[model samples]
Target chain A: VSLARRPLPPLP
Target chain B: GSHMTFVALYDYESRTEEDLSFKKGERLQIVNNTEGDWWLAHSLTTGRTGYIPSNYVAPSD
Candidate 1:
């Protein structure tokens, strides 16, 4: 859902 | 946040930078302020000091 160019952070 | 500043602030910071692009370059506005960069450079607003984020580690033994 994010347009982040990097890896996503772990979800809680 | 220095270089790694987030997107959320992009609206308030990035877009603002664009809106004021002419002045941005003239004013040289930046989102995240870093000490490493600031220490050796001049700040837009005078008497300004660059600051880094607090270390994320809990503690040392």
Candidate 2:
């Protein structure tokens, strides 16, 4: 089955 | 010592730009886990960060 993926925040 | 880390239990491939792929045994530094199902994590090995399924990881030792 497919999964959920979202954009991540930038690292310092 | 700092905590809030989990190790990947299964190898995963990123399906999109937002997902972070990881190999089994790789440790992930959890950045945000509010979603419960998907937790934003940083790849300890690749120095990359993205959202990964929370079920794919387990508590680190």
Candidate 3:
């Protein structure tokens, strides 16, 4: 994945 | 999906980035390969696997 799996967030 | 907004995440502009946490009603699975093994690896291959950000997204303009 070589990427970070960030928690979903709300669009500001 | 701003895997970035998720990390790039934050625009730091008109869109101040913020994180929110909530409970999941179901199970979730993430398929990551570029993971860093500071201790033990969790790959089924029993070998070191690639680890991506558990929550860090690549930021590209």
Judge the docking of candidate 1 as incorrect, acceptable, medium or high. Answer: incorrect
lDDT of 1 by residue, B24-57 (tens): 2211223433332211212243333222111211
Residues A1-12 of candidate 2 have per-residue lDDT tens digits of: 323344433221
Model 3: per-residue lDDT, tens digit, B1-61? 1122112233312122122221212111224324441111122222223332232233233
- Report the C-alpha displacement of residue B20, candidate 2, in angstroms: 0.5
Alpha carbon lDDT of each predicted model: 0.22, 0.78, 0.26
Looking at model 2, the pairs that clash are none
Pairs that clash in candidate 1: B24-B28
Candidate 1 fraction of reference contacts recovered:
0.00
- By the lDDT metric, which is better: model 1 or model 3? 3
True contacts kept of each: 0.00, 0.07, 0.07
Candidates in order, TM-scores: namely 0.15, 0.77, 0.17
Better of 1 and 2 by DockQ: 2
